[PDB]
């Protein structure tokens, strides 16, 4: 528990919904907790 929420409390609800096709799409494999974070911020 707490896979996508990690990006919500960090970035924002409306900020994760835009990159939901990537974040949740990555975790499905075996990403880390220090990846999706630096990833989103890097994109935006």
> Are 4 and 21 in contact, with CB atoms under 8 Å apart?
no
CA atoms within 13 A on the CB side of 22: 15
**4: how many CB neighbours lie within 10 A of its CB?**
13
The CATH number of residue 32's host domain is 1.10.8.860
Nearest to 39 by CA among 6, 14, 2: 6
Report the Cα–Cα distance between both ends of the chain, in Å, rounded. Answer: 25
- How far is residue 41's CA from residue 29's CA, in Å, rounded to a whole number? 20
Nearest to 28 by CA among 3, 7, 9, 6: 3
Range 30-35 contact pairs with CB under 8 angstroms and sequence separation of 24 or more? 33/6
If one counts the domains in the chain, the total is 1
- How far is residue 4's CA from residue 27's CA, in Å, rounded to a whole number? 9
- Per the entry, the structure determination technique was NMR
Give residue 35's domain range. Answer: 2-44
């Amino acid at each position: 528990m707490g896979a996508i929420a990690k990006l919500v409390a960090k970035f924002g609800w409306p900020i994760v919904k835009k990159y939901y096709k990537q974040i949740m799409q990555f975790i499905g494999e075996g990403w880390a907790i220090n990846k999706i974070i630096d990833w989103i911020k890097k994109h935006i």
